[PDB]
Amino acid sequence: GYYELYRRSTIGNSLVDALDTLISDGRIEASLAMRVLETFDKVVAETLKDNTQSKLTVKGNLDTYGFCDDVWTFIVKNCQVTVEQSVISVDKLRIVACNSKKSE
Amino acid sequence: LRRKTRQLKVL
């Protein structure tokens, strides 16, 4: 299998909010829900690195950082980022990352 | 058990 992060993203939480209604309506089974989330994670793992061309760089001050279960967690605050330039000021930003080694 | 390396007489 692959890594599991993207439900916390907007599309992922929107997708589980969509699928829980069909769970309530009985239109999707639990195994079907698990495998549709798994294939969505595989799809967003494959298509996010090939047909996109933008860039982002983050500079700031990190408050809390952690590394357990081979994921890197950061809480950077008073940070300004650059898109591709256009600069965005963020009061507090959270970074969750996973290793490049394939899981399982 | 098999010999790992050997000399090859070039010809």
Add this chain to the structure above:
Amino acid sequence: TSGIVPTLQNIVATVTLGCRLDLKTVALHARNAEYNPKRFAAVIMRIREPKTTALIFASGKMVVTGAKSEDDSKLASRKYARIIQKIGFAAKFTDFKIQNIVGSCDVKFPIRLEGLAFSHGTFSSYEPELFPGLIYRMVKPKIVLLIFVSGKIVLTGAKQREEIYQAFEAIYPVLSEFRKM
């Protein structure tokens, strides 16, 4: 005598917490806890205001480095123990021994290191190709000393102030005779 007292920069201390610890939970819940079990068999936790670094081991042991004074190391180890209490382990602060006290000072004159190596050859080992400093090993007290051409001295390997200090004014008379111009 010597007009300068050395200042400390790192103190390494050990603590036994007296209980087995699950490093997975303390890495998941404590804030600045980094657990890579296949890079090191401990979780690395460091906190800001004493600027120390703890190495929490699963057997309940402890190594606290980065402290400037012994009281600062004691306070830092107390705070790490208090973190382990606040997370939900029965980690009692049992003992606290400081192992390494490294301190630096600057004698404010350049030193002839080759002459010092030739004179006190039984204590000094000078290999400037590998390291640009002189390893002086005082037999009493057992404080290894790093002598440099800029006059910067690194005194390493003490258990309290009352070895590193008299190590420095035991090495000052044999450094005054080796001065450059």
Add this chain to the structure above:
Amino acid sequence: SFNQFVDYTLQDIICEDSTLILEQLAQHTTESDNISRKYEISFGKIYVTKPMVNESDGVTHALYPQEARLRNLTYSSGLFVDVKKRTYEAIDVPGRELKYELIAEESEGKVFIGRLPIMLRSKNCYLSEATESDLYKLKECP
């Protein structure tokens, strides 16, 4: 005889046993390591220096027979050969004949192989091109 040996026979001896091939069997317990390595060291052209001596402290300078007679040295010159390293690999499929290919590690590169004593007034020696006044300057009898 010495000029023939230096000019022609040395290269003939080098080229007779020039190629040194080592084949490393796969010895594969699993099929993931089904590669056989063939390492080849081949000697190329041989080079000879002018007569010279290396001293204790590593300095190498031109040696003349007057100094070599006085200092109990050996009037010899260095031999250098060209060595090209070939690395061949192939997929070790049993039954199928192995077809090796280079992994492009064809490193090549004069390497010192020894000191050949130089007979005086031969083509390699300094005294061959020396005039009578040059021989007198080198304290050699014409």
Add this chain to the structure above:
Amino acid sequence: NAEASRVYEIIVESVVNEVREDFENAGIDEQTLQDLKNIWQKKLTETKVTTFSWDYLISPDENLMLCLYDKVTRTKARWKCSLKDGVVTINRNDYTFQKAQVEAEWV
């Protein structure tokens, strides 16, 4: 951003092009697909992010960012964070990057 727009477009098209055979194996009707299309479009529009065409312890409308790290090296205070293949949701606006070097100094 049209880039995040078309990235989310190819996300939803790839999902509905992979799941249809799983829906045929499960045996549910085709009508379990275009309803998912319409609810997907309306939830992405109601998110209002991107346009479309259709004491030391760890304890939506939050500036977070999900990614994959290549290498994270660290010095005394500075933090090298080489990040790649991730999504951003800061200030209710979505972004995408190929590489992301992140520098933050540790107090």
Add this chain to the structure above:
Amino acid sequence: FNMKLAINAKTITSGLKYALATGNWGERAGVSQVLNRYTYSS
């Protein structure tokens, strides 16, 4: 693999030096003799 340790130049050097210093032509005696320097004709 060290290229310098592969070729021992002392092999060729000592072999030629030993077979020329001592007349034993191997590893035939009297092959190489000390040159006579009593007279020019000698």
Add this chain to the structure above:
Amino acid sequence: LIGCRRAEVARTFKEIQSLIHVKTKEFGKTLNIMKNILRGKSEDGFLKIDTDNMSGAQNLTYIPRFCSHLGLPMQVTTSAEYTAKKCKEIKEIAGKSPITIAVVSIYLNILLFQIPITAAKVGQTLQVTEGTIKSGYKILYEHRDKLVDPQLIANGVVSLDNLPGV
């Protein structure tokens, strides 16, 4: 390395590493242990005066070998030996490794004698970084008067204006 240092013929660590694939940290540990037990054996048995044989720098003994490797004339070698002898008085480079000190003195005398060898060629021959050689020459350009042999510029074989500025 101990045997090379004992016979006043000492090589460097990079030489022996070029022969023997030895890890540098444990090589230094092994050398320190061997020096300690050799001094202990000297104290227990017959005592030997060191008279600068176990010296860490030994930079005067590296000049002729490196000059031979660069194919330099003899007077460049003796001028480099004089320069490296006077480089000990300079405190700005007294902490540098003896290899780099010898290389920058050799390069200074190469520029002094108009020897047509670039700093890149010296760096390729002796694996001191061309940045390191250039920085050493730059930091030795201020002390031109003391380093250059006085009788050489007195006899006019070399002159101090030949060295390019920084």
